[PDB]
Amino acid sequence: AGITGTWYNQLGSTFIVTAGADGALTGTYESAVGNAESRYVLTGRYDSAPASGTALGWTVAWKNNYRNAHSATTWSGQYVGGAEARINTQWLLTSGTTEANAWKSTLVGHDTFTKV
Amino acid sequence: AGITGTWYNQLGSTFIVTAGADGALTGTYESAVGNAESRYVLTGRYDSAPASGTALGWTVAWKNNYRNAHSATTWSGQYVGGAEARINTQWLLTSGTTEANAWKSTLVGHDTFTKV
Amino acid sequence: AGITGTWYNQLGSTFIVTAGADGALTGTYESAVGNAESRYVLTGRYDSAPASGTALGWTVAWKNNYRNAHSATTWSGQYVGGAEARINTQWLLTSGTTEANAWKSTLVGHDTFTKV
Amino acid sequence: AGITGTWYNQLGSTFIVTAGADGALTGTYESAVGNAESRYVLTGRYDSAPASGTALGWTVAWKNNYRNAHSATTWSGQYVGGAEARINTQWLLTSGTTEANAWKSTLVGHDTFTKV
Ligand SMILES: Cc1cc(/N=N/c2ccccc2C(=O)O)ccc1O
Ligand SMILES: Cc1cc(/N=N/c2ccccc2C(=O)O)ccc1O
Ligand SMILES: Cc1cc(/N=N/c2ccccc2C(=O)O)ccc1O
Ligand SMILES: Cc1cc(/N=N/c2ccccc2C(=O)O)ccc1O
Numbered sequence: 001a002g003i004t005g006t007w008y009n010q011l012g013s014t015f016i017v018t019a020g021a022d023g024a025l026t027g028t029y030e031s032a033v034g035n036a037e038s039r040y041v042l043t044g045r046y047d048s049a050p051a052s053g054t055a056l057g058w059t060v061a062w063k064n065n066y067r068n069a070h071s072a073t074t075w076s077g078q079y080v081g082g083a084e085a086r087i088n089t090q091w092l093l094t095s096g097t098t099e100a101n102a103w104k105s106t107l108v109g110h111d112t113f114t115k116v
Numbered sequence: 117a118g119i120t121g122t123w124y125n126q127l128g129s130t131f132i133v134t135a136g137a138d139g140a141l142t143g144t145y146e147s148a149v150g151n152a153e154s155r156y157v158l159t160g161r162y163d164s165a166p167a168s169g170t171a172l173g174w175t176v177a178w179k180n181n182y183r184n185a186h187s188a189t190t191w192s193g194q195y196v197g198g199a200e201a202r203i204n205t206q207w208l209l210t211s212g213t214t215e216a217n218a219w220k221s222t223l224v225g226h227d228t229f230t231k232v
Numbered sequence: 233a234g235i236t237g238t239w240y241n242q243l244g245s246t247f248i249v250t251a252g253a254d255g256a257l258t259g260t261y262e263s264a265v266g267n268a269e270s271r272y273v274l275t276g277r278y279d280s281a282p283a284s285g286t287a288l289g290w291t292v293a294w295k296n297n298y299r300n301a302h303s304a305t306t307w308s309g310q311y312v313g314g315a316e317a318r319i320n321t322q323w324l325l326t327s328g329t330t331e332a333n334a335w336k337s338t339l340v341g342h343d344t345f346t347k348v
Numbered sequence: 349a350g351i352t353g354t355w356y357n358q359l360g361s362t363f364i365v366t367a368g369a370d371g372a373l374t375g376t377y378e379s380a381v382g383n384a385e386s387r388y389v390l391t392g393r394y395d396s397a398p399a400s401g402t403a404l405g406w407t408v409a410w411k412n413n414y415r416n417a418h419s420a421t422t423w424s425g426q427y428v429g430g431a432e433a434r435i436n437t438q439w440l441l442t443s444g445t446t447e448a449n450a451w452k453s454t455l456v457g458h459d460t461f462t463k464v
Contacts, residue, residue: 011451023157023177023179024159025159033451041139041161042161043140043159043160043161043175044159044175044190045157045158045159045175045176045177045188046177046188047177047178047179047184047186047187047188047212048177048179049179049184050186050212051186051212052186052212052213052214053212053213053215053218053221054212055177055178055186055187055188055210055211055212056175056177056188057175057176057177057188057189057190057208057210058175058190059159059160059161059173059174059175059190059192060161061139061161061162061163061164061171061172061173062163062171063139063163063164063165068163068165070163070166070167070171071163071171072161072162072163072171072172072173072192073173073192074173074174074175074190074191074192074208075190076175076188076189076190076208076209076210076222077210077222078210078211078212078213078218078221080215088218089210090208090210090222090224090340090341090342091208092173092190092192092206092207092208092456093192093452094171094172094173094192094193094194094205094206095171096163096166096167096168096169096170096171096194097168097169097194098168098169099168099169099196102169102194102204103359103381103457104382104441104455104457105169105194106192106193106206106455106456106457107452107454107455107456108224108322108340108440108454108455108456109322109451109452109454110322110342127335149335150336206456206457206458208340209336219243219265219341220325220339220341222339222340222341223336223338223339223340224324224338224339224340224438224456225335225336225338225438226438226458255389255409255411256391257391273371273393274393275372275391275392275393275407276391276407276422277389277390277391277407277408277409277420278409278420279409279410279411279416279418279419279420279444280409280411281411281416282418282444283418283444284418284444284445284446285444285445285447285450285453286444287409287410287418287419287420287442287443287444288407288409288420289407289408289409289420289421289422289440289442290407290422291391291392291393291405291406291407291422291424292393293371293393293394293395293396293403293404293405294395294403295371295395295396295397300395300397302395302398302399302403303395303403304393304394304395304403304404304405304424305405305424306405306406306407306422306423306424306440307422308407308420308421308422308440308441308442308454309442309454310442310443310444310445310450310453312447320450321442322440322442322454322456323440324405324422324424324438324439324440325424326403326404326405326424326425326426326437326438327403328395328398328399328400328401328402328403328426329400329401329426330400330401331400331401331428334401334426334436337401337426338424338425338438340456
């Protein structure tokens with residue numbers, strides 16, 4: 001119940017997710033930034049029997065029927081319930097590159113999601 | 117085909133994956149470290165229409181029928197095919213923590229997977 | 233002028249720094265968290281001819297005359313001037329470990345400093 | 349003695365360092381990549397009274413008499429002595445950016461330094 005719903009980050013992106021009783025996360029991501037357009041499929045996992053926040057993570061490959069950025073982001077973080085539910089994360093964005101450029105293929109950042 | 121198979125990291129963990137035509141990664145991860153015991157389920161996404169490496173990412177929540185570490189790792193990287201295929205990644209491992217310990221909830225590292 | 237001064241982060245730590253005309257950063261760090269006590273020496277570098285924010289970085293090894301945590305943190309970020317001067321960073325904290333534990337030796341986080 | 353010397357990473361960059369008795373690292377870094385040309389100054393800190401590896405870290409701002417990339421890298425890691433000594437690190441490279449691009453200002457990677 002907690003995790004399932006609609007969430008937004010500080011860039012204005014939208015994450016719609018359903019938490020399955022088996023630990024699965026499925027939904028769609030709508031990005032406000034990058035070489036973006038329309039929604040993208042996401043998939044992840046979460047601790048379905050937490051103790052503390054609830055550990056979780058998900059991935060988006062930035063390819064849909066309309067655009068392909070040849071890149072993927074993974075967000076790793078924890079869900080914190082309360083009056084104000086939040087998902088605090090750190091993320092890694094890797095771009096497909098040639099061997100010579102691989103050393104500079106990965107960005108790191110942090111995003112905070114607020115539930116709506 | 118390329119990504120689909122059994123891979124091993126430097127620690128000796130085993131990543132069994134199936135890459136779907138549509139961009140899904142599904143499979144099992146058997147760890148050689150941490151508060152482990154048995155296999156865990158993973159899910160991810162990948163660029164199913166690459167341009168040089170193939171961007172991808174996946175998540176494992178460290179909970180199975182035997183134990184629960186109340187944490188999850190996300191791996192973000194690229195698959196590089198050829199005679200000696202490899203998946204080069206960076207990872208983030210987040211633990212569920214109290215708010216007071218949240219500043220130190222996330223470890224970062226790098227893993228190289230090969231078929232040997 | 234800009235960077236030189238006293239700054240605090242969201243954990244309540246204090247950073248006192250002087251920016252030299254040659255790109256050097258020198259000062260002391262006073263930590264609110266960890267296996268801490270008293271102040272620690274810092275040293276870093278910054279872009280002394282920026283374009284955009286000003287790139288910079290610094291290190292603290294958590295050893296003084298009173299305690300030794302056998303660890304060091306590096307903060308990498310940029311200084312942004314204005315009414316409200318800020319230093320936005322991401323950091324890595326590495327602990328000295330045995331070979332068997334090296335894979336889990338490094339934490340990653342983010343800190344925002346406000347000038348006083 | 350141990351840390352003091354000339355080291356090389358996987359890219360072929362050269363790190364010339366002097367470790368002070370008190371915990372200071374000082375030296376020069378000559379890059380084999382990026383918007384480079386010549387040597388750059390570095391400064392860092394290290395644990396001068398280790399317990400297994402020796403925690404350390406350093407910064408380079410990418411500005412010299414010839415060019416300025418308006419960025420800086422920080423390396424955080426540990427020195428492991430012996431017959432075949434190594435410095436294993438993770439790094440963060442931050443570029444000075446406008447606020448609109450700040451979300452993607454930081455690259456993350458890993459470097460291994462050896463004496464060969
Ligand atoms: C659409 C698109 C988005 C993109 N990075 N997105 C993100 C990355 C990290 C954190 C948040 C976002 C975010 O969108 O909220 C990169 C290429 C691209 O084509
Ligand atoms: C079994 C178990 C494993 C664990 N970290 N593993 C990893 C973390 C990062 C990269 C690789 C692994 C790897 O296993 O290959 C953390 C909790 C836990 O219960
Ligand atoms: C005193 C002490 C501090 C410590 N982490 N500090 C930090 C690490 C990352 C970001 C901010 C801090 C901060 O202090 O603002 C780790 C061991 C230790 O003995
Ligand atoms: C000369 C130059 C280099 C640069 N990144 N270098 C690096 C970054 C991370 C790790 C190693 C290096 C390395 O050189 O070993 C970025 C701007 C620039 O002008």
